Design a protein around this ligand. Structure first.
Ligand SMILES: [Cl-]
Lengths: 103, 108
């Protein structure tokens, strides 16, 4: 169907991620590969974000609007310099439109 | 004064039973994971639309004279410990993570 997203986005598989921020606001290293019960996986992250810069289809003469990137949190083997551990880390997941009254 | 076009609720969820994997098949998701003798709940950060239409209908702040609109969910892929039938494996599964407005050019 000829359906359009209000904000345009880009999705990509990320396999070379080296750093991230966890759910507690801490910066961490993200490992390239993980050992889970004697299986070896690469850490891939499916990331979606706005393209470089208002929103589309907006009733403009009553609203200001911009496109912004929102996130999810995804478990990952990480290292903070003190402890190697699985932690939930912030990942870009969508491009969404935000409104404000024009005045 | 920032307003969201489509309102969201995000929730940490550990009671998933079924999920759709990246190849389309339904699978059962295990409630717990054992990774090198550490045992975790298999949490997912899951987002839903609150209302299909926060405004009159469709999405908020939309030019309804030219557009049909509706708030729907989009998904990411998270690796998860799953059971397809009797085979238990790590698979990428679909997890909703945002509510976005979808536009449709109104009928002629
Ligand atoms: Cl949106």
């Amino acid at each position: 169907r000829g359906e359009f997203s209000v904000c345009d986005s880009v999705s990509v598989w990320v396999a070379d991620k080296t750093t991230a921020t966890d759910i507690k606001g801490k910066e961490v290293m993200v490992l390239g590969e993980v050992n889970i019960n004697n299986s070896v996986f690469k850490q891939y992250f499916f990331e979606t974000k706005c393209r470089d810069p208002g929103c589309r289809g907006i009733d403009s003469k009553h609203w200001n609007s911009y496109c912004t990137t929102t996130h999810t949190f995804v478990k990952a083997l990480t290292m903070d310099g003190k402890q190697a551990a699985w932690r939930f880390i912030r990942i870009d997941t969508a491009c969404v439109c935000v409104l404000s009254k024009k005045a």
